[model samples]
Every structure is written in structure tokens, then in C-alpha cells.
Target chain A: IAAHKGVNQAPVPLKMERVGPHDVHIEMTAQITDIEIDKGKIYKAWTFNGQAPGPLVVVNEGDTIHFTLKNMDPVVPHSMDFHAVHASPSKDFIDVMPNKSGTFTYPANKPGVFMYHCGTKPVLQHIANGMHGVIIVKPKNGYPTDKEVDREYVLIQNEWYKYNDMNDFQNGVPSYVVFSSKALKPGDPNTNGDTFTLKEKPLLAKVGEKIRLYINNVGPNEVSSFHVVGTVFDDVYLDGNPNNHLQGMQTVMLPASGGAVVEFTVTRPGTYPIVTMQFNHAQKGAVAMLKVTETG
Target chain B: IAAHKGVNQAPVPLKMERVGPHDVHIEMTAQITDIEIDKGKIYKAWTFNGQAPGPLVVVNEGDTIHFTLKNMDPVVPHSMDFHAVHASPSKDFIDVMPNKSGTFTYPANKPGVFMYHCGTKPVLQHIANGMHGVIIVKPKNGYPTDKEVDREYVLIQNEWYKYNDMNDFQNGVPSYVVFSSKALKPGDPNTNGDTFTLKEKPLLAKVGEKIRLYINNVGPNEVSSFHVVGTVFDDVYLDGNPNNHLQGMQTVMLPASGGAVVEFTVTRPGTYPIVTMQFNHAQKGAVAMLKVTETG
Candidate 1:
């Protein structure tokens, strides 16, 4: 799973911070790397820390976020744009040229999922190239969510465009869509369930184990209808905010470049698909799995 | 609630035709009328029966749908396109000139929720102008589901863009975002929850009763993350297909021009806001309520 058209369960840790009581710091590098698009396609993709979704940054609402953005790519500059911050636009739009770094800080006043992406010129291409991740700012005294989870994981849904240039919009097609590092591109001789294949090993958990998922969408365009075929979310922290914990979400819509947290426990042991709910998207490579194994 | 920014509950009947077991008919007319974009702003909108969202078309799978679409709009020509039908796209895309009529028939071979909308030139302008509705085709041998609902309702989420012409695209902001003729426009001194208001009354139910909600998103653009504040879904049927049910969901994502069915039993009697999980969309009026009454 090291080569292109393969998988990597993210070599980095989710928490990349903790400098002082009032602040949290993150040092991330944006680079150009070859990423697997589907079963037989590999594309040059821009990523944060060598991963499509970069790393998740979590902090408390009152904490100030200090970030060092390094543009390690051979070409093109990059900048950080935190969707969570309400500060001055220019203060956060610091551009770091290729092979260089820039730093900035902003207060995390709100507890929610804030999409962080490269605000460099041609943002759409940067985002489409995989320069986006999610930040979770939790309330200092997190609201009671009714129950705690036994396991936690993160999944970022994104799309891979097929075209090499903007003129490719004439075709209006994506090469493949993905859930984290996983995909299920349509195979030849369509229908009969032979149309797709999973590109990553699924997260394994025991049945009855409460699973919390930090779901984010780095969608170039598609809005994900996140659904686990055999289970429902017991608690959906709306917008990934603990203060807005909602119970009983069957599927939560994660908008393009948005995020959410959902928790659930599957009673029966089975291999379930975590898909967009749209058959076309699933067939065109945006499918992953949730295998609930029986517990002793 | 017939004034600007109010609800009509769709006065048209649910069943427009009744005949042999295999056939059904519909006689719907699209008319141009003044629709409330804001509290005091009215715009010329195309709708069925002088109201937005047209009316529900319900029938069993395998039943042949016979539709007679009439363009009652005085200036703009309109047309109807049933999303539920799998027939010829070329044949069903019949355009009706102003004051004219057209007819079409297609078998409802699929069982699920489908969106109907104007299939005219400038389709976005047409749909954003309130030219849309939902069609429900119940499965013939209804698939198995874990729970039976004591009450069922369909909530179609849509948005309205206020524009005199395409020139309004300068700002690219919608005038009003709504849920079936209801919205809470940004009011005087916004952000205190005072700006928010409900158009349609709350979904009333007794505690301990199971509620089934068929939610459709007819977004000209926006996707809906449908969430009920106080409850978790006991079951979620993707695309309203019982066979595709999931359990223990906290929120359900509705795709534009797509549908989902969520079922949950209320344990406590209280009011719950069913809003799009994203605050921006909810603040823009994509919100509603569910009221569960305590029973002694």
C-alpha cells in the first residue's frame, strides 16, 4: 500500500499540538505527491504532510491556534485558510512560497468543524489537488453527548478529477471519488455488482463497540450523504460541535469542505458499506467499509 | 399563513388519478404568480396551483403514471419532468408553451422518492424559481423494515433565489433560503434567535409514537444535512427504500433532488428543531420543527 494507486492509513498522528495553556500549535508541510486515484490510475496530487486529507487538528474553543505552514512542493505557493476563524482576512491569508514557510495564529472562538485549506491562488485546483483538512474545536466543558465512544476514527471524502487542465471541464467528469484513502471505481462490464472494488482495508471494530467517526468532506464539488448501510448514527454532533449534539441521524450531509462527528454502535456483525447513498457515487469510487466483527 | 413567507401545505390532493390497479393519472398545471422571497418582498415565481413545490404524486410501484402538464403561466413556457420515471428522456421532456398543455406516461418501476421539476431552458432559473415537487412510489411487496411508524410526513427542503435577472449573480447570494414555503429571514438585530421564524406549524406527535419522515432535497444548489435536535433515528431508509434501512442514525443527509426516510420514536414530549446541520444553511431558512406532546 505504499505505491501510487494504493493506500496509506495516514502515517501521522491526529493531534499535532500543545505548546501552552492558552495556545495550540501545528507544523504541517504541503507537498506534491503521487496519489492513487482508483484501481489502475495514479495522479500527481498536492497534499498536506504527504496525505490527501493532511492531519486533523483538535483544540479547545478558547485556545489560540498557531500554525506553521510549509510549502514543500517543488512548484506553486500555498497558504492556510481556517474556516473556523472570524479574524481579519489578511491576517490569515499569509502565503508561503514553494520551499518556504509562513506562520500565523487565530483564536478558536467557536466549537465546530472548520475546514482548513490552502488559500493560494486557484484555490479550486489546490483543493482539488488535496490541500484540505479538518479542525475540531471542542467546548472547554464539552456538552454531554448522552454516551461516550469505544473507538474513534476519521474519514475525509474527496474527489479526483480526470482532466489535466481546466479545459477538461468540457468532459465534466472526475477520475475517481474517494473516502479517505479508499475508493471503489467502476469496473468493466457494468452492473451485476462487478462494477467496483474497494481500494483500502476497512477500519475493523467489534460489534456493540460504540464507534465515533470524525467525518470531513474535502469535496471538490460533491456533497456527501454519509451513510453506513447497516447502522445509524446514535449521536451526530452537528457541524462537529459538541454543543449541538443530535441523536439518531441516519445519514449526515457533509458539505464540500465541511465536517461532522457521528457515533453509533452496530448490534449485528457484518461488513457494511460507508457510502454517499447515491448509487452512482458509490459505483464511481467513493465507497469504504465498516466491518463489525463479533466480540467474545 | 398565506401571506409573504408562509405555508400553504399544498392544497392540491395527493391522488390525482384512480383507475385499474396498473394505472394512475395526474392533471397538474404550472402557473406564474407572486411568491414571497422575504417578509415584504414578492417575486414572480413559477409554481403549481399558484404555490411553490407543486404537489405530491403518490402511487405504487409498477403502476403506470399518466401525467397531463399544462402551462398556466402567462409569460414563461414551462414543462414537467418526473424523476421517478425510467422511460424515454426525449419523450418525457415535453415543453409546454404558455397556456398550452402536454401529456406523457411512464411506469413507476422504481420504489423510492423522486423529484419533479421544470425541464425547460434555463433549468436552474426555473427550479430556483420554485418549479419542483416530490413523487413517492411505494414498493409493491414492501421490503422489510425494523419499525412501523405511527405517523408519516414528507418534508421537501428547497431554496429560493431573489433575482430580477441573472445580474443578481454579482453577489451570488440567495435572497431567501426556505423549507417548503417557510423561512426565518435575517431579521432586525440578527443572531439572537429572534431572526428565525417558522412558516409551517411543527410536526405534532405524541410521546412514544414512532415518526417516519420522508425528506426530499429539491435544492437548486444546496444539500441538506437534516437533523432533529432531540432524537436519534431508529431506522433510516436510503432513498426511502425499506430494504436499504440503517439503524441508530443521529442525522440524515439529503442530496439535492434526492430523498431519504427516517424513523424515530420520541421518548420525551418537547419541541425539536429539524434544521440543516450546517448553521449557514439553517440560518438562511432551511429549518423546521418537530413537536412531541406529552401524553398522560
Candidate 2:
């Protein structure tokens, strides 16, 4: 497993300028930093150069990503691998030694959702410790232009585990991990049969409002099907790919390091549970809420 | 309002015995007593013939109760009033002087639940200051010979407000001194909801089994409608009166200071919630569960 101090770091804030009609020019910097993982805590390592899943990068299809990477840590060497990077297999675009920094550029050629992670030594451990982020490659045709109301929320689901000592933390080694999946099991001895039950909360919504949900999974393992009881979406994009749009299904499969972009219109006012198709997951931790408010 | 320490006394525990096949016997040495109501709690002042609700005299319907009242508290005179005593209103067993003991006997003629309190000077304050107990004159017919099941639990519901001193307490003013009917609305704010709701535990049962429910309300206020959601009971007894076998009702009406005996059979296997029919009592403090085990 990778043992760099500052692992996956959050991206530095960036500024974007409207370059042309329906086009935006953005700028960002990525680096390696140091982060401590406390024993017993869910996450054990850091991110990019050293920060958590660097800053979120939002760009439309065909947009070019002009970004630079700076390595400040004096330890192991590091580099990055963008799922969207098709031509840079030799360098993997991640080349930064201790205190050394580098720059890389590539066109945002594909339309859909993709993940970028550190492809350095001990790849599994790096990704497992949370060195990955989502890239939503918008479609060339843009979001459904016919919708009357547009609002979006970004939801990232991840697992957390605890490790007491740095040495005990190994790459891909089974340790005491606490993930949301454990919550989806039935008849858990710890909680009796009360597990997997959802208590309804008050719903507040007006009819005819369209809602867009952005879902992402930063998992080192396990796949999930996101489902909502009592309601259904009209459109779905697998792996953030607009071309893979399909009619709405109750539960949508979400692969590891993958995500889906979904849009639905609220036609009724009710309290519904946003859960995982693996029923037990909703009970475990992969659950949230969706409430529709009433209109006069 | 009664004054704090107006009376310094202790509560007496009364022992009652179910006598004969249908009669209940309560035996105790009765004497005038003083009680202190803590101030700043809820209400002040209390009653005792050295007993909180004085001496309890219990017997079966058609039986007789022989009671002796001893006046021991030299400061004030005392007497007894049976809320169920319906003989002559003008001279219906009232008034007994302090420092003197007297003996009297009364026939248990009624087959219903009733309350008894002090009937001497400052009578309203006397009863309001915690001088009351329930009396059940069992029906002459005795209990039903064919009870659906063998198990039974007595559930008593009461409202309690703690008062630190006696001086600030009020007597039978009923409205302000006692639990006011208006303040104790169907769904009192103090209670989570206005109605009584029953949570049935998961029941496993054979094709058929009987269950008996014994419910009692020691309410200083508020009436309730005992109800079972999704099912109706086989039989109900109001005020514990075997003579009044109310039948085929989804909800049983229970007045304040009342009790009921209900019976039901497990004919089907399904989860259901038993609730109070009152406007919102189900949302408040009155909720419990009834789980049936599956048959072999």
C-alpha cells in the first residue's frame, strides 16, 4: 500500500471565464501533499500530490483541460492517471518526485463520467485510501435543453475504515474497515431486526418541479444500484456518459469508481426513501431522502 | 391554595386480595394522617388517613365491605366519601371527627370502577391534594369462563406533576388545582400526540390463538378511544363491567378514570398497529405492542 504522508489532496480552487457562447474556460493546479490517517478512522490516506480528491473539475465535452501538477513531498514519487486520458499511457501524466512539480494537458474528448487517480506504485492502496475524483464530461448537445427547471446536487458515496498503526496499513490488505455496505445486511446481531427499516420524514415539495441528481461512488470495491422507493426518474446517464442515456429504472447499477447523472420531475407530493437496490445497503449507510413539497 | 407542610405525613401501602371466586378484599387499619406536598414542583398538599388515598376497601359486587376509620391527626378532623356511594346524598356516609375512631359497613352494589376521596372540610382541596384511589366492584357473574388466552397484564396510565411545596397547591378547584380537562386536550401538548397508539411486536402464531388486553386509565384528565388498526376485537368490557359486553366495535370508548377489558384472536399473520382513536392520542404517550408467535 502507498504510505505517502500527504496523499490525495483536494483540488485548489479555480476560476472560470465564459470564453464564448455556451463555452467556459477554467484553470486549476494539482499537487502532492501530506495527510495523517488516524487509527480507527474511516479513511487512512491522503490524496493528489497530498490533498483529498483535489478540487472538482467541471468541463463540457470536447473542452481541453490545461492543468499543471506540483509535487512538494520529499518522499516517494507520484503521478496521475485520468480515465479520460487515452494517449498518455507511457507517462500516465503523473510525474512528480519529492519537492518536484510537473504540468500535463489533454483534451476533454469523451462525453460521460470518468475517474482520475494516482497510478503510482501500490495502485490499489492509493485508490482505496481515496485518491480518486469524478470527472463529468458533459455531452456536446448539453443537458436536456427542454427542461423548465434545473437544479443539481452532487452526492458522493464512500467507505471509511480505521487502522491503528501505519505499518499495519498495507495495500489491499484486509483490516478493520467500516464501510456503508455493512449497514445493508439483514438481522445484524448488533441491532436486532430493527435494521433495514426506514422511518418516513415530512415531505415538502411543490408539484411539477424537475430535479437533477448527480451520483458518484468512490469505492475500492463493491457495486451498488441506487433506487428510490415510491418514485422514478425519467432519464439516466451511466458513468456520466450522455450517449448511454436510458429510460429510467427503479434501481440503477453503479460500478466502482463510477457514477450516474439522473433527472426526474416530481409529479406527486410525498415522502420517499432514496435507497440502494441492495436493500441492506440502505439500512447500512447508503441511504438518503427525497421529499416533495405541496403546491397551493 | 394549600400551604406547604400544611400536613406532614407518609404514604401507606394498601394490600388487596382477590377474595372468593369473584370478590376482591382490601384489609387495612385506617387512621387520620397528614401528607406534605413538595413545593415548586406541580401541585402542593396531599391527603392520608395516614394514607395517600386513605384506606382502600375492596369487595366483589353483592358482597360487603367492613371498614374502620380512626382519626389520628389531632390538627384536623376527617371523613370519607365514596364516589360510588349512591345512597342518600344528604347523609350518605360522610363526616368523621378527628381523635376518634368509627366503624361502618357498606354493600358493594355497583359493578364498575369508581373513585373515593376525603369528604370533610376543604373537601375540594382535600380530593385535589392527592386523596383518591380506584375501586372496582367486580360483577356478580365473576370473570368470563372462556378467556381466549391465559396471559394478562394490567396497564395503568396516569398523569403526574411534581410539586415541591404544599402552600402553593390548590384544592378541588378541578380546573387549576387538578388535571384540567381543557388543558388535557385529546392530544395534549405534553403528550407526544393526542391519541393512544399500539405497536404490535412481530407476532408468530398458528392459525388461531386468543389474546386478552387489560387496560386502565388513572387519568386526572383526558378520555381515550382504544382502537386497533386493521382489525376489530372479538369482545370488550367497559369500566371492567362484565355485565356490559360491548361487541363488534373497532374502537372502545374509555372515559377518564375508566378501564376496559378487550379480547382478540390471531386469525391471520400480519403486522398491525393498535392505536387510540382520539384525534391525536396515537401520536402521544399511549402506545404499546402485542406480538403473536407462529403456531407449530
Candidate 3:
């Protein structure tokens, strides 16, 4: 991995670490940091835990999350708004002033993939500046295809601009639309100059094995027509809820702050590209690749 | 209804006219026309049957459509692409050259609300310049909630730039996001100056009656977070397929060229605004009203 301007290029760890049975403590730090968007391109980003997408938070459906936010940014206030929790936004999602800290608790009563982002006023800019991530609440019994899944991964879709230009944001002019995967890193071998996806770091899967994807579109402006070339989705759990299931879909449409749990199996050993079927966005770099082989 | 530059402000009719049992012959004409966007604002639009959104085309599953295209545009070529069919796009969706005509026949094996648009080169521009509409292929057995639906309507959401600005289209910049309805006209009273929706022409229903909306997002550029402010959707048929069912959704996300059939019941009598919860788009006139009354 390469480091540029204090931005780390290593993949963000996606594994869940359970320290307790019924309770989970989530600690996040908000700070102004430099994060790489593409090769030689950095945005002075507002991030949680120093990553553009913050970090993946996972818990069981009935678990309680003790969330602590430490705002390390010297001049701006930041806050957390979890879409999975039912709480008063004004009370629980209130701003933590610059150089301040706040603590809150909520129950994970919803079993689905939900977006958590900074909910301060002018939230679009807050989110567009990289203040969002996904929280997955696993159902008590697990997904129906859990036993058949050979690989599970998280892919967060977002957009970037040349700079933090409100005019551009308001007008929906995005410079790049890309995916954030825990399996990818900058400075890796890739077909496109865009470093969001790499040739050497494709999401690995075994032929004939099911692959499950937890996809979130944290779009501040665009919608995602999530599709994987060469394969159709065998099952789609809209918004990642087991009860909202559908089968045999070519593409699943996701709105901003919407998500789904999609499963598919690759029968042949090959590389497949995951893209937003909105071809223009795919042309702007909203794509990732999957590598399936005979061996694990 | 008023007329400006040969543009008709009358509401496009929504009733489905079935000419036969198994064979349905449909005719459409392509021409250059002026269409109203906002009050006093007009665009030179490429249209089918002299209407911006063309007209609603409906058929039962398994019916064959004998389609004819007459291109009255003196210099431009146009064609149709039906998303619900499985035919070869290159052959069946070929162009009808200027002042020329073509014919084709295909079966509507799939059941869904699908987008039909011009398949001409630079399709984005052709679609953006008012060349799209929805085709509903009713499932042979009908939707599970069909009998409960008291009022049914079609709403096609699309974006409008001040002009046909390629720069704006490419960057996802849209000036207005509005809905096209058979119930709305240019000069009808509306809360907003944007005439896509009218105060006097609200979608009417009785209190406690179920309303079903067939929504298609024909975005040459944006996504729609289809939502009704006063009620949660009781059933959502993803892509309008009966097999793809979801329930209790606050917002149903429709990608560009994507759609869903959503049903809900209003218990109280009042005006409810249907909007794209993507507040920015909603602010830009992506809103319509439902007037539920105690009487039919």
C-alpha cells in the first residue's frame, strides 16, 4: 500500500469483531483529513476515523450500540445520524461542536443494511465530503443463503467532484463516480487509470460458490442501477431486509442512502465487472471487478 | 386547455383501449413540437403523437403488439426500444429514418411497468428532449391487490433543463424535475408556478379507498425516490412485476428508466403530496397532489 499526504491506501478492514454478546461499543473520530480520490488527486475530506467511508459497523438485530463520537476537527461541528435506529434526530443526532465529544445509545431493531452519516445542516455537502458509511444489522437467524455463501463483501458507491463546489453539487455535476471496496487499494494493478478498483485485488470467489454483496449507494446526488455483467442476481433483499426479498433480477435500482443484499453464483472461472448500468456513471469510473477461480 | 405555438395543454388521456383479444395494433407518429415546461417556458421537443411523454400504452401479458412508427420529422431518425421485451435490440429496435416508417411485432411476455423510448443514436438527448413514456404490461392473472385498487393513475417523472444542454445532461445537472400526468395541464391551478401539477386536477379518491400508482422514472439524467408524504406504501411491485413484491416501504427508489407499481390507502380526507424524497429534486417541482375526499 502507498501513503500520500497522510492518506492511507491500505484496504479498510471489513471483518466484524464481536466483543460482547448483547452490546457493541462503536467509537468514531471525526476529523478533517486528506483522502485520495484517484491517483494524484486528494480531497481535503471530512471523514470519520480518517477514512472517506468511515468504517463498517456490524451488529445483531437485537443488539444495543453504544456510540461515542470524538470530534477532532478544530473548526467544524459534526454528528452521527444512523438510518437504522429510530430516534429523534434533533436529540440524538445533534451536532458535536468543534473539539468536543458526544455519546449516545440506540438499539439495532432493524435487520438490514443502513446508512449512517453526518446529519448536520447542509447534509448534502456533509455527505458529499465523505461523511457516510454502512451499518449492517444481521437478522437473528441469518440470511437464507448464508450457508451457501463463499464470499461476503461490502461495496459503497459514492461520487467525487474536482473540489467541494456547492455550485457543482447543486447542479449535480460530479467529476467521478466510484465504488469503495474493502478488497481494493490504490497503487495496485488496474486496467483503468482510476485506482478505485484494481486488477490484482479483485473480490475473490470460487467457481460454483455463491457470492453475497452488501451494496450501499451513499449518493449525495445520483441513483444507482446496480448490475453485474455476465450474471444475474439470484436473489435480491431490498434494503437488505429478509422479508423484502425478490428473485431473478437483472439489475436493482437503489436510491441515495438506499441499499440491498444481492446474491449470485459464478459458474465459470473468469473476471466479471460490477457496474452502475447507468452507462454514463460507469464511464465516469463507477465500477469494480470480481475474480472467480476453481480454487478458494 | 390552452394552445401555445401549436402545443396542446389538455390532459393526455390515461384509459387503456384494447382493440382486440390477442392482437393489438398500435400507431405512433414522430414529429417536432413545442411543449410547455414551466409557465411561459417552451422547448422544441421531439415527441410521439405530438405529446412530450407520448401516451400510455397498456396490454395484458402474452399479447402481441403490432407496432407502427411514422416519422414526420423531416430530418431526424427515430425508433422505439421497449424495455419489457426480450427481442434483439439491434434488429427490432432499429431506426425509422426521417419521413419514413417501419413496422414490427413482439409479444409482451413480461409483466411490468416498462419504459419505452427512442432508440436513436445520442439516445440520451433524444430521451431528454421529450421522447419517452411508460408501457404497462398487466400480468395475465392481475396484481394481487388489483381488486382493492379504487383509483389508478400513471405518473412519469422526468427532468428538464432550461434547454437541450449537452453539458448539463452529461454532468447530471437538471433545472427542473417534474411529473407528467394525464390529470395535469399547463394552465390548471397549482400551488407551485411549475405547471406539471395542478391544484384543481388532483388525483381524486375517496377516503379509505386504495390508490395505485404506476410510476416510471424516465430520467435522461436523475433518480427518483418515489414517496407519498401522508402514507406508507402497502405494496411495491419492483419493476411492476407481481413476482417482485415488497411491503411497508416509505420510499420506493426508481432508477432512471426504472419503475414500480405502488399501492396505498388513505384513511383521512385531505390533500397529500406525492414527491421524490430526494428533497432537492422535490424542491425543483417533482411533486403532485392527491385529493382524497369523504365522497366518491
Candidate 4:
């Protein structure tokens, strides 16, 4: 049994098994634990496979996927919805009964970035609880595997409501809440006392190198404007659709549950902010930076 | 004597004589005094025209003006710079000597808004000390001074620093070293601890009514991108020049120590944030709202 670190923990290393050259088998589970609804009481906390983000499933386009889900928790029914899988919502394996296991097979039809998350009742709560992860269905032509690359990085953007300690996971209470930071200050004055600060570790990339960013937003609310100053992306995959690639845009707008996979060829050596066009959010919520270093 | 507010203690009011229907004759004096730069001891402070922000000068465009500056303070030499005036460094009445006042005049050729401040050694310190004021040079043809409007207001954006009450003004101190709200929690970090919150107050506006905003930045450093959510100005006196207007601007960009006069006719009533587009100032230093009410 793997010691699941859960949502608040670091990203768990998802296990993937290649059954064959063209087929892959992936197994995961979703669960709901206990969390504190109130200050002192604990309730069953909802999650996917006992963790917030289920698992990462990676496969090449044209590959067939044999996915298995086991719902070990008895209290709540869990489901999985793939942003990449285009199928009937009712039959799309989004809802699986507790104490039961189900398996689904689908051909990886698209080559791009995608997201999968639990779509159970209290949908916002489910996402806010962390039942989300990324699936990269590599293109049939595939990425430039032969291109000599020195580094690769993944940046996943999400919002969290710090309501309680992780020890309150036993209470089926949701941990995410949307409250104005302004209201939290003393005196309740509409002044400088309340503001949200977002910190992003700098990204250092070599000049002229192609960098890929798998941008995902598991937001319950608020639009995230993906922006990069002093740099422009060369390719953009909107809503996780590789087939719906758009020309590189300086600023990409991402709404709730929506994201883009952007690729930019670094040309300048400077430090620039990756910001949301919704200016306020850029100041308070979804803000990051990219630093391009001179190539050796 | 008026109570000295932020910096200097000398209260000098500017004297002006109307020389023509559109022209005004103006003269003023500025001086520096040794006030306890340290916090514990209080000393007599310096000032422009012996007053903070000097004096209010209301004039009209196409008006030629004669002005004389007398620096009475023997300890520190003083100069003046009109943020609204444009000319070569030599002609721009800056860096005037102590005890020596120079008489110079220029046509108030452009209408709109402007500011005059000390531009002597340690320019930032001079501004921080107290040498600034508003200059509203009305359009040559005049504005719609219809009595239908009920009220008008002015807002000036500035940054402040706190040094020891006993220390004299230093020349090499960096503006960033000064205590500044814009500096403390820049780029939205201050949002969580913001003293001012926009969420609680909804900016009000009515349909088909004119509102004027006089925006100025008295910054040691910081570019302000002034934006009013959901409203666009019908007329913008960019760089305080009514002769060089920018109309229908959703966002007005203003640099440090810059000012602009913006007029907008509200078409809808709603809440909106009048913010600085500089990513962080809205969350930190610069934030306000425009409340528009419906009238018959």
C-alpha cells in the first residue's frame, strides 16, 4: 500500500504500467476521508482514491487506454470526468458506486494536454478538495524527442482556502471557502490591511529553447488570465484540446475548470512576470514569473 | 499659521494677481529649515511659499504668466519644476539658488491639469518634504460649468517615507528605502492584509451624467496605469494637457509625479474599481472608487 500524501501534500508520483507498445493499463482509486466541518468536530472528507488529485496518466496518441478505478470508501460515490475524453456524460464513467470497481477503455484520440477530476455531487467541493490531475496524450507524430533539451518543468496552478489543519481530514467537511481577504483585517476598514499575496518560484530557461507549460486551473471561481511579460508563446492548446491549437497569444484567458498548454520559444534573457490579465488577480492570486538565461 | 501636516512647518500661501481675463500673475517663495530629522525631536520644517503643496492656482489656457520665485531659506537652496510645463532643462525654472529668486513666465497655453514641485538637490526628498500643489488650467473655451452638477472632488496619489525625527534630509537615500505602502506589499501581496477593500463598497454611477477625475501621482517611483472598471473616459487630459487630449481611454497610463484630468459620462450605474494597472499598486498603494448617483 502506498502512503498517499493527499491533496495538501506534495504531488504524488502516479504509477503507470505499459502493458504493451500500443496499449497501457492504469489503475487508481478515489476516496472521501474525514475533515472538520466545525472547529472541533470531524466529518468524512471527500477525495479521489483517498487523495485530492487522483493520478497522472501519460500515454501517446493512437494508444488504447485501459483505465481501472476502485472506490474503496463506503460513504460517498465518486466519478471521473476526462476533459480529453469526448463521450456521453451519463455513460462517461463519471460516477462509480462506492465499494465497487470499474474499468473503461478508450483510444487516446487527441495529442495534447488534458485534465481529469472527480465530478460528484457538490462539484465545486469535489474540485476544491483536489480531485484533479493532468493527462498528456502524446501526439502520434510525438514531441521532438530528439531535440537536445537541458531541462523540463511542470507548473500546475490552483487556489486553496486555508480553513483548517490537515488533521481535520476525517470530517466530510469541505476545506475550500471563498472569503474576501479584505474582511479578515482588523477594524474591518476597507483599507490596506487585507490583500492576498501570491508567490511563484522563478523559471529559468535558456534563450532560444522551446519550453512547454501545461497550464491547468481547477478553480471553483475567478477567471485566471495567463500572461507572460517580455515573452510570447509560439503555440497554445486551449481547453486541453491539442486539435484546437491557436496561434501564440501574449495573454491567455482561463476560466474555471479550463486551462491551456502553451509553448514558447525563449528569445530574450530577462526576468518577466507571468500574470493574469484580470489585473487584480495578477496582483493577488494567479501570478508567476519566467526568467530566461543566456544559452551556453 | 495652518497646522503643518506631513513634512514642512513653514506655512506660506502663494500670491496671485489676475493680469488678464485668462492670465494670472503669480509669485511664490520656498525654503528649507532644519527640523529634527529624527523622530523624538521636532524642529521647524521647510516649505514652498512657506506652505505645504504651495497654493492652489486656477487659470485658463492661452494665458501668459509672469512668475517670480524667492528662496528665503539660507540653509538650503531651492528650485521649482512645473510637471505640466514642457521645455529644455535650462528654461524650466528648476534648481533655483537660495536667497536668489528668478523671475520667468510662460504662456499657460495648454488647458487641463498640472503640478508644481521643488526640483532642487535630492529631488525625491524635496517632494517628500512638502513642495507640491495642483494647477488646474481650464480649457481656452472653458468647461461646461453648468450648475446642474452637485459636487466635485480631487484625488492625489502619493508615497511617503518615515525617517528619524532628528536626522536632516539626506541626498542619497533611495526612494525605495523610504517607508511606502506601495513598496511594503507590492504586487498583491498586500491584498490579504489590505487596509482598504473594494468588495465592501460598490462604486455608484448613473446613466448619462458627466463626472470629472483629477488623477495625480506624487511618487518617488512607480508608474500608475489608472483604470476604472466598466467605464471609459470621454475626455482625457493626458500629461495634463487639454490641448493634447486622449478621449475614450479605458485605461490611462501615468508616470511618477504625473497628473491627468479625465472626464466621463456615465452610461450605467454599478460598482467599479478605480485602480492602478501596475499589477501591485491597486493592492498596495493606489486604490479608490467613483460613486455616481442618478439625477433628474
Distance from true location, Cα of B276 in model 1, Å: 1.0
Model 3, position B132: C-alpha lDDT score: 83
- Candidate 1 CAPRI assessment class: incorrect
State which candidate has the highest lDDT: 3
Q: Residues A70-174, candidate 3, lDDT per residue (tens digit)?
A: 877666689999988878888899999877889888888889989899998788878888888888888998888788777778888888875667777787567
- Please give the lDDT score for candidate 1: 0.65
Compose the digit string of candidate 2's lDDT tens values, residues A51-93. Answer: 3444455677777665555554446566677776455756546
lDDT string for model 1 (B1-296, tens) is: 12323322233333376777888988888776665655666656667655567676778878888888776665677877676664333346558887788888766666777677787655566776677887787877764653476767777777666553433321245555566522112221111011133434565678888887777887665566788788898888766665556789898766666677788888888887888887787777767677788751
- List, residue by residue over A1-296, the lDDT tens digit for candidate 1: 12323332233333356889978888888776665566456666667776666666777888887888877665578888888776676677767987798888888888876788888777877787777777777777664663567766667777767534554423455556677632112221111011133333556668767777777777777777676644456567767877565554445766777778788765556565666643335546666766667661
State how far residue A159 of model 2 sits from its true place (Å).
2.7
DockQ of each: 0.04, 0.01, 0.10, 0.01
Share of native interface contacts present in candidate 1: 0.04
User: Comparing candidate 1 with candidate 4, which one achieves the higher TM-score?
Assistant: 1
Q: Is model 3 an incorrect, acceptable, medium or high docking prediction? A: incorrect
Report RMSD (Å) for each prediction in the order shown.
Answer: 15.0, 23.5, 8.7, 17.2
The runs of at least 3 residues in candidate 1 whose Cα sits more than 4 Å from the true structure, single-residue gaps closed, are A1-296, B1-15, B167-171, B181-200
Model 3 misplaced stretches (Cα beyond 4 Å)? A1-160, A163-172, A178-222, A227-235, A238-244, A248-251, A255-296, B1-25, B64-66, B104-107, B182-197, B248-250, B268-270, B293-295
Q: Compute each candidate's TM-score over C-alphas.
A: 0.52, 0.40, 0.60, 0.43
Per-residue lDDT, model 2, residue A84, is: 60
Task: Give the interface RMSD of each candidate.
Answer: 12.5, 27.7, 5.8, 16.2
